[PDB]
Amino acid sequence: NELTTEAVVRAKKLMKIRTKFDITREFLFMQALKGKVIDANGVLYADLYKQFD
Amino acid sequence: AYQGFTKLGEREPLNDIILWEEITPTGHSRKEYAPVASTEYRVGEVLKADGSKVAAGQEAQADSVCIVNFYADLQLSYHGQLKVVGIYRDAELKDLLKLESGVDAAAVKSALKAKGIDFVPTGL
Amino acid sequence: AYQGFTKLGEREPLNDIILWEEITPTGHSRKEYAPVASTEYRVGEVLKADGSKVAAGQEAQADSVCIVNFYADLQLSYHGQLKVVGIYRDAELKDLLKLESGVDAAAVKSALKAKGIDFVPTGL
Amino acid sequence: LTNSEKSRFFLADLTGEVQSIPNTYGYISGLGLFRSAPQTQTTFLMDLTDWD
Amino acid sequence: LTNSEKSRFFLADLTGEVQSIPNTYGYISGLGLFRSAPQTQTTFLMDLTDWD
Known part of the structure; x- marks a missing residue:
């Protein structure tokens, strides 16, 4: 018979946001290590091999 | 529509109709049943041998008085x-019984009386 | 139990699907329905004009999405x-829509989009 | 705060109970007319005498 | 002690709660290969000079 508090929901939402950004940063770093910076949707933002010839 | x-x-x-019963190491006065599908049992409902409730015309087939929900x-x-x-063997129960529609109460009482169950008069 | x-x-x-809505004092995007009989409502289902749910084929109606249980x-x-x-007017909601069965989502969203309702992509 | 109706994830408030007790009368017993006469046997006798 | 499953007048026990947190793989970000280069513009240029 305990009610939830607004602070708990706040903390959950911010923690989820930080986790999402962390995993996205990890994915982007791996993509940069591969050689081309491609978004998770598939959009190409940097082709290093053609930039540097 | 919230009707008010x-x-x-x-x-x-509650299971409180039992006034006296022959209690032994095992259930001398109480027997177990396999529940029938889509059937709800309450305390004080008369059951037949197969486990279903006593209906109209089947008063002589009364077997036991249910004591669990x-x-x-x-x-x-309700006890998990x-x-x-x-209760089917000799015992003394309160007069409160839950019978179905068109069930002769006197016929049920005589059928359970022969098996050994007596019903103390209860009043209010 | 007897089934393990x-x-x-x-x-x-819960009613967390709302992200942005007009905050007019009397309620701009909120419209009030009357329950259809024997009909269960949850937050996230698309409702027709007469309080009923959108079935297969009638995606063009799509008056609103429920925000109460x-x-x-x-x-x-849900709250007594x-x-x-x-929600039936211009607002931004997560696309956690509950659609019946056969009701495609593209036609429902397009009908809601013409009414000002925008669906933010959600992800899990 | 026990539980909501038809849901185990919301709460409602059990404000209280309304007891409804039966009414009993005690005027005659309160009058105190009868005198207690404890006895050991199941029956008793009395003598009725009248000069008249 | 909470309400029973199918009765509002009998009680049961709430033993506790179990959680299922999704698993995340942080390995590349742990290597610490990329260097932070904060910028005040929306784009940057570099000069490529080479000789043979």
Whole structure:
């Protein structure tokens, strides 16, 4: 018979946001290590091999 | 439509009708039944041999008086038990009984009287 | 139990789908319905003009999306209110839509988009 | 705060109970007319005498 | 002690709660290969000079 508090929901939402950004940063770093910076949707933002010839 | 009221429900009868019974290491006066599908049992309901309730015309087939509350959809008794039980041998019970529609109360009482169950008069 | 498993129920969805809406004092995007009989309402289902749900083929109606969990049998609601209310005008909501069966989502979203309702992509 | 109706994830308030007790009368017993006469046997006798 | 499953006048026990947190793989970000280069513009240029 305990009610939830607004602070708990706040903390959950911010923690989820930080986790999402962390995993996205990890994915982007791996993509940069591969050689081309491609978004998770598939959009190409940097082709290093053609930039540097 | 909220028609004015909300009735959450009425409490199911408690197992307190047993006044005296022949108690032994095992259940001398109580027997177990396999619950019938989609059948709800309450305390004080007369059961037949197969486990179903006594209907009109089947008063002579009365077997036992249910003493546990069973939930048909949950398939568990209110005590977290798997099977329904009832008093069928010699015992003394309160006169409060729950019979179905068109069931002769006197015929049920005589049928249970022969097996050994007596019904002390209860009053209010 | 006598099946080895008992489920007490999934929790009904909460009203977190609203991301942005007009905050006019009397309510701009909120429209008030009256329950259809024996009809269960949850937050996230698309409703037609006459309080009913959108079925297969009639995606063009798509008047609003429910934001309350109405319980049909006792005629009361998620927060104890006699009416069901949905978002029917310009607002931004998560695309956690509950659609019946056969009701494609592209046609429903296009009908809602013409009414000012935008769906933010959600992800899990 | 026990539980909501038809949901185990919301709470409602059990404000209280309304007891409804039956009414009993005690005027005659309160009058105190009868005198207690404890005895050991199941029956008793009295003598009725009248000069008249 | 909470309400029973199918009765509002009998009680049961709430033993506790179990959680299922999704698993995340942080390995590349742990290597610490990329260097932070904060910028005040929306784009940057570099000069490529080479000789043979």
